[PDB]
Design a protein around this nucleic acid. Structure first.
Lengths: 660, 94, 55
DNA sequence: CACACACTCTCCAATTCTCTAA
DNA sequence: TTAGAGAATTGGAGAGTGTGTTTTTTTTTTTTTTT
């Protein structure tokens, strides 16, 4: 009975505000706006119900009433700003935007959260997408042009002349930008209280019919940003950095770039050439597929017996097996219906924290061109200044930072410092000094301390937020060394204290997500190349790398060849290639896991024949087989020792791993 | 009352007649090697021996599961390491 | 082949050596055909010509 | 009717896990 | 850090409740509109 009364009040407020067909402000509009604000605030935190927002979304208040308020105020604001009760006509938009940011606030569910919040999270996440869907498509999304008025009114006055109260207005308006663009589809929380049936989840599309994946992607957000001029707003806000406009702004312009790769920026009928190439690749893989299918129908009945050792007469069907004995053996292998158990595992805005390499958001060519220059202009305007502004705050309240701050800060830092270096690599028009300002000693030691502290608390996500920056630390050290003593103080503290941390993560993180494993291989590849120009010892750092779990975690990445790219396979294979003659530690490489992956590599079903990956790999595997034959021919026990793991006995450790 | 338990890789089963003696005997007279041929054929021929040994020794489990279980047993059970040490000591005499 | 005690390898080799080096003259003499004087239509590699036609 | 199918109700030993082991 | 003694959980066979069939429209009258 309480819920339907709440619905009655929401409907009563809906018909009290007014409507169209020009929208009309009803009597006591401010009073009803304040009443709605008070009710929503009371039910949000004081009572923790999350039901008033639901009723508002139901009456389509945000679309039918709230948006037209700002749209109707926009023309009056333009007329007043071009002509040359303004306070009453200005304060009306304040409450509307305060309501908008409150409803657009992301919803977080944890164990401490009550059942109502988790129950309504799945029913309100779709409405969250609805809000951003209707906002972006509302006549070029001009509501953001009205939003920036709620900031330029306060920022216009002198910064030293700021207001102890009006200062919260800037935070409230700024939160709206980061809230609207952080809206992403949620997860279908399957009810796992009982065993699931012989069929899985039917539909994973968490989108209401009014919401389409076309109209909610970050491409739409970036197009709306460009068409609403707010690029100038974001540039001018950063141009006047010289506190409260730093923490929100850290993620206001980061959300749409939290997971967008920089490779799509440069291509390296224009879109149709890649279309033709992809058609060629899929034609090749389909051609490889049909090599197994019989020339005739399945019911042709091709039966055979393999005269296997012991004169066995095992019967396996299939005319395909009559072509090759290997096909018959594979049909023998996959005939078994028994399988083992494979164990498996975002609380913060989804991104690298949960995005596979192929999740490249489609961009319009014009939109891509605009976004290419927008971020470059931001870097040329205020990048290092913004970093130095938050350097002081980062040095304090180390234990007072919620896990959201690390994931929203470290990813931003690493992504932009990586983008600057790749942009400088592709084109020389950008100086390295534009990113060289991040080599400050205090910033480096603080970020390293955060990375090491995240290890002991089992905060794997926060630690993965740190490796992505640690890779670019070594990359930038190399870039500023080759293109050149400031780099020494940043790249000499990893002598004894930091070697354990970098040499332990690969041995333990192999039982987690793919990206966690991908971080460590890049770390090792970068660290093996930064020190090559000075060699504290080349033969000593590599000694701690040649360990069996390290080889296991490197070879576990190779099993995903159906999705590994040229560089992903290149780094993994080059790690073993660079130690073939420089280290000569191939004895630990003698597990069957690498041999079966080599068989998969050279097989046409794996790597592409026309590409430039399988040729050098095939030649190196040809040499690998020669090494295997030479080492196996000299030890009969090594024929079966190749399968079993190595031993801890003293004499055999040098007898087998080194051959006396 | 209770189902027949599934057969697992017991230590005794690892020393079957069609096991270690068979592979040790046929290593030097089963697989031919030639670098002129494509490496894929050589690798497939090499893995053929282990696959047939696993199937005729344990037709229940597949290839990858069998090798993973064997690796875990070798890393865990020290009797396999003791046997490997004994064979290494025997081979050291020559 | 199961249930036959016949090796696939020997059958493949038999059909392979039957494909080329075979001439229609063998068929012409198999049926005791009197008009086996023809050379181009009999002594030529019939199956090789067929394979070339397919190519 | 009853034999065969599909599936909810129900249940111990092999498979995983982290406290105490070497 | 290693080979080995302790907790803790849940999938694969089986007890069991309720199903699902076989199961049919021929041939023969009677009417009605065209032929």
């Amino acid at each position: 009975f309480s819920l339907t009364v709440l619905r009655a009040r929401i409907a009563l407020l809906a018909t009290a505000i007014g409507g169209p067909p020009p929208y009309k402000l009803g009597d006591d509009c401010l009073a009803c706006l304040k009443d709605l604000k008070r009710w929503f605030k009371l039910v949000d935190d004081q009572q923790k119900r999350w039901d008033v927002a639901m009723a508002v979304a139901e009456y389509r208040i945000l679309t039918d009433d709230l948006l037209p308020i700002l749209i109707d105020w926009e023309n009056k604001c333009s007329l007043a700003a071009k002509l040359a009760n303004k306070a009453y006509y200005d304060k009306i938009a304040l409450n509307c935007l305060q309501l908008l940011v409150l409803m657009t606030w992301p919803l977080i569910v944890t164990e401490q959260s009550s059942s109502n919040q988790i129950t309504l999270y799945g029913e309100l996440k779709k409405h969250q997408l609805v809000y951003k869907k209707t906002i972006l498509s509302m006549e070029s999304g001009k509501v953001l042009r009205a939003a920036i008025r709620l900031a330029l009114d306060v920022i216009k006055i002198d910064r030293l002349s700021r207001t102890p109260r009006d200062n919260m207005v800037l935070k409230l308006v700024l939160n709206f930008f980061r809230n609207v663009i952080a809206i992403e589809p949620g997860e279908f929380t399957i009810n796992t209280k009982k065993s699931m049936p012989k069929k899985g989840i039917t539909s994973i599309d968490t989108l209401p019919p009014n919401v389409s994946m076309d109209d909610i992607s970050l491409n739409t957000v970036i197009s709306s940003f460009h068409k609403n001029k707010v690029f100038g707003f974001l540039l001018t806000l950063t141009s006047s950095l010289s506190d409260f406009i730093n923490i929100p702004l850290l993620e206001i312009m980061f959300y749409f770039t939290k997971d967008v790769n920089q490779e799509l920026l440069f291509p390296r009928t224009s879109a149709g050439f890649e279309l033709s190439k992809l058609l060629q690749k899929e034609h090749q893989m389909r051609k490889n597929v049909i090599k197994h299918t019989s020339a005739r129908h399945s019911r042709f009945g091709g039966l055979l017996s393999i005269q296997t050792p012991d004169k066995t007469r095992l019967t396996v069907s299939g005319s395909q097996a009559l072509v090759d004995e290997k096909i018959a053996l594979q049909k023998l292998d996959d005939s078994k219906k028994w399988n083992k158990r494979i164990i498996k595992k975002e609380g913060l805005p989804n991104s690298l924290l949960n995005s596979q390499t192929g999740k490249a958001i489609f961009f319009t060519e014009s939109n891509g061109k605009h976004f290419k220059e927008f971020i470059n202009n931001f870097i040329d305007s205020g990048f290092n200044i913004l970093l130095h502004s938050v350097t002081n705050y980062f040095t304090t309240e180390q234990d007072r930072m919620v896990t959201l701050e690390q994931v929203e800060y470290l990813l931003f830092f690493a992504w932009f410092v990586k983008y600057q270096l790749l942009r400088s690599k592709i084109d020389n028009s950008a100086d390295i000094k534009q990113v060289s300002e991040a080599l400050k000693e205090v910033t480096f030691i603080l970020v390293s301390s955060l990375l090491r502290s995240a290890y002991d608390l089992k905060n794997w996500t926060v630690t993965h937020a740190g490796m992505i920056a640690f890779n670019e630390l070594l990359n930038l050290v190399s870039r500023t060394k080759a293109a050149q003593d400031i780099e020494f103080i940043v790249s000499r503290l990893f002598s004894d204290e930091r070697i354990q941390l970098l040499s332990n993560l690969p041995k333990i993180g192999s039982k987690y997500s793919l990206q966690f494993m991908k971080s460590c291989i890049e770390l090792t590849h970068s660290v093996l190349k930064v020190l090559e120009q000075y060699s504290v010892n080349f033969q000593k750092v590599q000694a701690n790398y040649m360990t069996e779990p390290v080889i296991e975690t490197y070879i576990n990445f190779l099993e995903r060849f159906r999705e590994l790219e040229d560089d992903s396979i290149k780094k993994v294979f080059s790690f073993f290639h660079r130690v073939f003659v420089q280290a000569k530690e191939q004895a630990l490489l003698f597990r069957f896991d690498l041999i079966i992956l080599l068989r998969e590599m050279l097989s046409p079903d794996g790597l592409d024949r026309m590409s430039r990956s399988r040729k050098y790999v095939s030649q190196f595997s040809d040499y690998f087989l020669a090494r295997l034959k030479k080492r196996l021919k000299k030890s009969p026990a090594w024929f079966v020792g190749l399968l079993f793991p190595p031993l801890h006995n003293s004499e055999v450790g040098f007898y087998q791993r080194y051959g006396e | 009352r209770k189902r027949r338990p599934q057969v697992k890789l017991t230590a005794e089963k690892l020393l079957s007649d069609k096991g270690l003696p068979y592979v040790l005997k046929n290593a030097h007279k089963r697989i031919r090697i030639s670098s002129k041929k494509n490496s894929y054929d050589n690798l497939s021929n090499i893995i053929q021996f282990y696959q047939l040994w696993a199937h005729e020794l344990f037709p229940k489990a597949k290839f990858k599961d069998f090798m993973k279980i064997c690796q875990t047993v070798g890393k865990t059970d020290p009797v396999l390491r003791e046997y490997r040490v004994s064979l290494f000591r025997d081979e050291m005499g020559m | 082949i199961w249930g036959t005690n016949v090796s696939i390898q020997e059958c493949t080799t038999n059909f392979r050596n039957f494909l080329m080096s075979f001439k229609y003259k063998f068929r012409k003499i198999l049926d005791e055909r009197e008009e086996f004087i023809n050379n181009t239509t009999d002594e030529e590699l019939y199956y090789i010509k067929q394979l070339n036609e397919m190519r």
